[PDB]
Amino acid sequence: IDDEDTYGTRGTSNIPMRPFIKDLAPTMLQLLRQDKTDSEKPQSALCTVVQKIDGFAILYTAKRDVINVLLQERSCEGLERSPQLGDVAFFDILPRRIETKDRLIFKIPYTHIAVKKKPDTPDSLLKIDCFKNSVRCFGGVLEMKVKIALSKPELVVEQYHDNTEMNSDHHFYYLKATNGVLVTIPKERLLNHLNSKLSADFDLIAWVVHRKPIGNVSLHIGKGGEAYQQFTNGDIRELPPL
Amino acid sequence: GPDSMSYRKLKTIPWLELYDILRSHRNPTRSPQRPHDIKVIVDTMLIGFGKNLRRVGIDVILPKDVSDFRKYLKEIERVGGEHLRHIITVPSKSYEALKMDYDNYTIAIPELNNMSPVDQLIEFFDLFNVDIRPEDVYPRCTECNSRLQIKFPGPVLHFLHQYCVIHVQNVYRADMSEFPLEEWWNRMLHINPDDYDGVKVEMSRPSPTSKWIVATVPTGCLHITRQTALHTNLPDGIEVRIHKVPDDEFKRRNLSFYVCGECGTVACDGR
Ligand SMILES: [Zn+2]
């Protein structure tokens, strides 16, 4: 049940223009302007404009091991006009070049940089519309509907523990969805529904939230996020909240 | 001392009380600076001190260990320029060692660790010229150093606490469908900005019946039923560390809360 939260939110058109408070990050625009790429073969990725900052944009992408993409309007190739919030297109991207300064300054909210906006083809335009139908946006947050096929033979579960200073005693599962993306879930919320092989007799359906990552995974079910157990016998009920 | 008493934690002192103590301490031979323009890194025995410096807004690196500390010092020196930092330590073998390569930036403050949090700050303010202001209740996250603090009227965080902590804790919940969502939505609509420093909370949701309720303020927003806060400067949100707020904080009148947009810690002025 995609429910009332999907009304007026499906797609990427409900993304608000959020002000950038410059005096909190007075050197931000210089980093974005100056940032460079590692010199390897660029990889294609489906990206969505989620933030705009005077001459720059941050893009979300579900591509594995990519946590957001910086778009430099002045350096990126293939741009017909300034990006707009909710724009979806394919970009060639590269990892940003790591600098010694990185340790000494604010957290950098992207891992990759767009090098070119790929021209659109009849096939890619079909993939773009498909993606729009699979996500929903509101209040500045993107969500994606996913299915975890826990009831099928392929292993789609992995435990992840993060001993970071503030999340030492928080344990999670990485879940692999049928569409290939990784999502997180608090371990205690799902542990007692799995067998010893980390499978189960149901599939897990949920709109997952995009936000700051646990490890390299930036989609999350959370403690109380609405999630649904689809049992092989046909029954559907909610996974209890944690 | 292992058997000596504990000092009042800085977290319990109202900022205005702390402002009155510190505003009269400065080194007049140094150029005055706002806290965020002062860059500091603390030796490994001064982590709590560094967190207290963050409280008044100083930019502080907290090393995880001696190796981490030395790596920072090498990197700061390699980068130089605007990124050079004052190195705070105490008289010790560490200080002696630091002088061999960082004499010009290292300050050793005697007895800094046998000394109350407020007295620690007074020592720092006597050495520097810090320009503090009464309105800066919580300029910086003491836990991760971030300046990106989202300021909410207390009722917003009370809403969050009841939905994310209390509802599932007091009786078994198979789902969240029994939470009085409309009651709390209507209370959000009638937060008097005059009671919370003029902060007007803008409430939004996709539809009158939708549970995707968002509270937006000038510094960011809070997606209540997603337990996710998002500072206006950032593209990605953070899970709010709401289970760590004592229940009693929400009985305080006209209290504002700060949610860190980078680590999710919740903070407020001391009682
Ligand atoms: Zn923080």
Residue numbers in the entry:
A (entry chain B): 326 to 567
B (entry chain A): 628 to 898
What does the literature reporting this entry say, word for word?
The MUT-7 family of 3′–5′ exoribonucleases is evolutionarily conserved across the animal kingdom and plays essential roles in small RNA production in the germline. Most MUT-7 homologues carry a C-terminal domain of unknown function named MUT7-C appended to the exoribonuclease domain. Caenorhabditis elegans MUT-7 contains a specific insertion within MUT7-C, which allows binding to MUT-8 and, consequently, MUT-7 recruitment to germ granules. In addition, in C. elegans and human MUT-7, the MUT7-C domain contributes to RNA binding and is thereby crucial for ribonuclease activity.
Further trimming of a few external amino acids on the CTDs of MUT-7 and MUT-8 yielded diffracting crystals with one copy of the complex in the asymmetric unit. MUT-8 Asp330, in turn, interacts with MUT-7 Lys838, which is further stabilized by the interaction with MUT-8 Asp328 and Glu551. Next to MUT-7 Arg853, Thr855 forms a hydrogen bond to MUT-8 Arg536. In humans, the insertion is mainly disordered, but in C. elegans (and other Caenorhabditis species), it forms a four-stranded β-sheet (aa 784–868). The surface of the β-sheet participates in MUT-8 binding and mutations in this region (R853E, T855E) abolish complex formation. Interestingly, the zinc finger does not seem to be directly involved in RNA binding but rather in coordinating the CTD-N and the CTD-C parts of the MUT7-C domain. Mutations in the MUT7-C β-sheet prevent MUT-8 binding and result in RNAi resistance.
